[PDB]
Amino acid sequence: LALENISDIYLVSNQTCDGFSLASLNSVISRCANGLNVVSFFISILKRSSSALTGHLRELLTTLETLYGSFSVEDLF
């Protein structure tokens, strides 16, 4: 929905409905957002504000960017 009402975001990649391209937002009610549009947003907000990261969130910048660079989009048919 909007991130005024967003608390947890799950990125399960093996035992979910379909795979990495689905990621469930929730707050309780849950949603079914887009996979490569939440991962490709959190890369773009940690890499943008790279002057304030505590040293633990740089591991989030490296995990999300590796997990996004391995998804073959041409096999999403």
Epitope: S13, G19, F20, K47, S50, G55, R58, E59, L61, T62, T63, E65, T66, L67, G69, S70, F71, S72, V73, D75
Partner: antibody
Framework: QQVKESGGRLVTPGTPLTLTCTAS????????MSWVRQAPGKGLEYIGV?????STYYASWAKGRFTISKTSTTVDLKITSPTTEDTATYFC????????????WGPGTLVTVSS | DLVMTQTPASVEAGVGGTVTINCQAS??????LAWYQQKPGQPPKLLIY???TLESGVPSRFKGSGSGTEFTLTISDLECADAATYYC???????????????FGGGTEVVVK
């Protein structure tokens, strides 16, 4: 699930050689294939990596000389100019998306380069 | 790229002992490491990934520890089938922002007697 690489032969030093690596039994396609080297009796040496999106990276010494390029089902290495010190055994290491657990390793094809 | 000074070159113990391997990354790679185990004439088998998480299939003996710039493996109660070469790999090598390379270690034989 398993990984096999294939194609390595004796070459005249200076004839370009390509090795192929076939992923046989995987279900999801989020992979980071990687090639490593081992000269006979030495430690392992890292060569490069290729993603699913095509994002290729190389090591510091193996820049310019090697080229990793994927296809629909294979991952191809290309040695541009095999010199005499490029004789080794070449492995293929595939994993899941996180890029940290290089779990499946092929048996190895033994490239030898000498006229 | 960074270097991995894997010390020592060859360790030695007996059955029921414990060994230690050290390797020191040149930059703060931050608990992204992996330990392999290559027997003579085999492809390397993964043991520990992310420097403390056992690969599903290894015995409970292998352990790994450390973060920042210094890491260690401590095989314990060395069985007879432990004479192999042990490498440590820095798996910080697939990104565009940091990308600290992916070089292996120097090599350590673990021979029993």
């Amino acid at each position: 699930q398993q990984v096999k690489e294939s194609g390595g032969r004796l070459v005249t030093p200076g004839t370009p050689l390509t090795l192929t690596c076939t992923a046989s039994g995987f279900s999801l396609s989020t992979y980071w294939m990687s090639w490593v080297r081992q000269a006979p009796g030495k430690g392992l040496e890292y060569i490069g990596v290729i993603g699913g999106s095509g994002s290729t990276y190389y090591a510091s010494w193996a820049k310019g000389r090697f080229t990793i390029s994927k296809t629909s089902t294979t991952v191809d290495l290309k040695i541009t100019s095999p010199t005499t010190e490029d004789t080794a055994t070449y492995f293929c290491a595939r994993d899941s998306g996180a890029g940290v657990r290089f779990r499946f390793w092929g048996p190895g094809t033994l490239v030898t380069v000498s006229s | 790229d960074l270097v991995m000074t894997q010390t020592p070159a060859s360790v030695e113990a007996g059955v029921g002992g414990t060994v230690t391997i050290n390797c020191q990354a040149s930059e703060n790679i931050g608990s992204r490491l992996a330990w392999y185990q290559q027997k003579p004439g085999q492809p390397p088998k993964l043991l520990i990934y992310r420097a403390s998480t056992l690969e599903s299939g290894v015995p409970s003996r292998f352990k790994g520890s450390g973060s920042g710039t210094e890491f260690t493996l401590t095989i314990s109660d060395l069985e007879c089938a432990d004479a192999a070469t042990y490498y440590c790999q820095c798996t910080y090598g697939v990104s565009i922002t940091i990308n600290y390379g992916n070089d292996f270690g120097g090599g350590t034989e673990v021979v029993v007697k």
